């Protein structure tokens, strides 16, 4: 059975992630949505002997009900399966012992989504290069796509698909390293002009085969990596400007419309865009196959 369709049947192993709550100190809301919010929280040892350290906390707020607490778990459930890799969110521990909201901590991103950073970043960038000190760069823009292949390619090993992959749900850390992420009920997508009334859905973001069959698989995710990299060399700008999201917009992308290209692209970045845009999902390239890419790009660009 799908890893994360049916992950009630996944094991919470207790004994190894419960995290007492008396160790964990809560701070300022990170994120909010209608039911879900991230919360910054300073926990005691939680990944060192005796070490204090900062992580995010999501959980439920007023206004969730037992569902919301179910999908939760779930959440919890996944994220367990899925396991550990550089690029992924890392789940460090959880509260699930009765007297106290669940609970699941992961490590603590400080720069918070990709979109909103890049987009504070404009005034803060330069192709190639003191004075640029903290300035991305090209080859900042290139490692950050190579690095959410790399988180894809990991979950689509562990058997899992994201179905809402976009930089508002990439997080970037210190060092230049990028997490793939789910805010779900964390934000609140009857409010977010990305998600439109189709039901709220990421239409920009969504393959054809997404929009008018309701199908979700790892290309279709390939196809939302394509969105991805445009938001990335367009330093956060929303997709398809100014075009209104509706029947029509989704008919020309079933007839080939596509996005031309962003600000800050290299002309293989562009390529690579439209190859995940390709109509059909086994002609679209693999994760495996865009890391491979990607890789090369990354090293080409400090050449
Ligand atoms: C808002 N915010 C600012 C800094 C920050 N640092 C860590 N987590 C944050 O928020 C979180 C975002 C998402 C999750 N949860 C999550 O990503 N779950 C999930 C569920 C299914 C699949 C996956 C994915 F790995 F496939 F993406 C992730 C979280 F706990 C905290 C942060």
Same mark, same amino acid.
């Given at each position: 059975?799908?890893?994360?369709?049916?992950?009630?049947? $996944?094991?919470?192993?207790?004994?190894?992630?419960?995290?007492?709550?008396?160790?964990?100190?809560? +701070?300022?809301?990170?994120?909010?949505?209608?039911?879900?919010?991230?919360?910054?929280?300073?926990?005691? +040892?939680?990944?060192?002997?005796?070490?204090?350290?900062?992580?995010?906390?999501?959980?439920?707020?007023? +206004?969730?009900?037992?569902?919301?607490?179910?999908?939760?778990?779930?959440?919890?459930?996944?994220?367990?399966?899925?396991?550990?890799?550089?690029?992924?969110?890392?789940?460090?521990?959880?509260?699930?012992?009765?007297?106290?909201?669940?609970?699941?901590?992961?490590?603590?991103?400080?720069?918070?989504?990709?979109?909103?950073?890049?987009?504070?970043?404009?005034?803060?960038?330069?192709?190639?290069?003191?004075?640029?000190?903290?300035?991305?760069?090209?080859?900042? $823009?290139?490692?950050?796509?190579?690095?959410?292949?790399?988180?894809?390619?990991?979950?689509?090993?562990?058997?899992?698909?994201?179905?809402?992959?976009?930089?508002?749900?990439?997080?970037?850390?210190?060092?230049?390293?990028?997490?793939?992420?789910?805010? +779900?009920?964390?934000?609140?997508?009857?409010?977010?002009?990305?998600?439109?009334?189709?039901?709220?859905?990421?239409?920009?973001?969504?393959?054809?085969?997404?929009?008018?069959?309701?199908?979700?698989?790892?290309?279709?995710?390939?196809?939302?990596?394509?969105?991805?990299?445009?938001?990335?060399?367009?330093?956060?700008?929303?997709?398809?400007?100014?075009?209104?999201?509706?029947?029509?917009?989704?008919?020309?992308?079933?007839?080939?419309?596509?996005?031309?290209?962003?600000?800050?692209?290299?002309?293989?970045?562009?390529?690579?865009?439209?190859?995940?845009?390709?109509?059909?999902?086994?002609?679209?390239?693999?994760?495996?196959?865009?890391?491979?890419?990607?890789?090369?790009?990354?090293?080409?660009?400090?050449?």
């Amino acid at each position: 059975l799908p890893l994360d369709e049916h992950c009630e049947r $996944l094991p919470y192993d207790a004994s190894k992630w419960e995290f007492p709550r008396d160790r964990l100190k809560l +701070g300022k809301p990170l994120g909010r949505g209608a039911f879900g919010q991230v919360i910054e929280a300073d926990a005691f +040892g939680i990944d060192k002997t005796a070490t204090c350290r900062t992580v995010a906390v999501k959980m439920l707020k007023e +206004g969730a009900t037992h569902s919301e607490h179910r999908a939760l778990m779930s959440e919890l459930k996944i994220l367990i399966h899925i396991g550990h890799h550089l690029n992924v969110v890392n789940l460090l521990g959880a509260c699930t012992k009765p007297g106290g909201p669940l609970m699941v901590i992961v490590e603590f991103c400080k720069f918070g989504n990709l979109s909103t950073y890049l987009r504070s970043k404009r005034n803060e960038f330069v192709p190639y290069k003191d004075l640029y000190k903290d300035f991305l760069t090209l080859e900042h $823009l290139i490692c950050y796509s190579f690095q959410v292949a790399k988180g894809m390619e990991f979950l689509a090993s562990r058997k899992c698909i994201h179905r809402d992959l976009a930089a508002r749900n990439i997080l970037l850390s210190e060092k230049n390293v990028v997490k793939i992420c789910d805010f +779900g009920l964390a934000r609140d997508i009857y409010k977010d002009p990305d998600y439109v009334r189709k039901a709220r859905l990421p239409l920009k973001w969504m393959a054809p085969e997404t929009i008018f069959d309701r199908v979700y698989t790892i290309q279709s995710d390939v196809w939302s990596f394509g969105v991805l990299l445009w938001e990335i060399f367009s330093l956060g700008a929303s997709p398809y400007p100014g075009v209104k999201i509706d029947e029509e917009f989704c008919r020309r992308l079933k007839e080939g419309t596509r996005m031309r290209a962003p600000d800050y692209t290299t002309p293989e970045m562009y390529q690579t865009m439209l190859d995940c845009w390709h109509g059909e999902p086994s002609q679209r390239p693999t994760f495996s196959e865009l890391v491979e890419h990607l890789g090369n790009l990354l090293q080409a660009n400090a050449q």
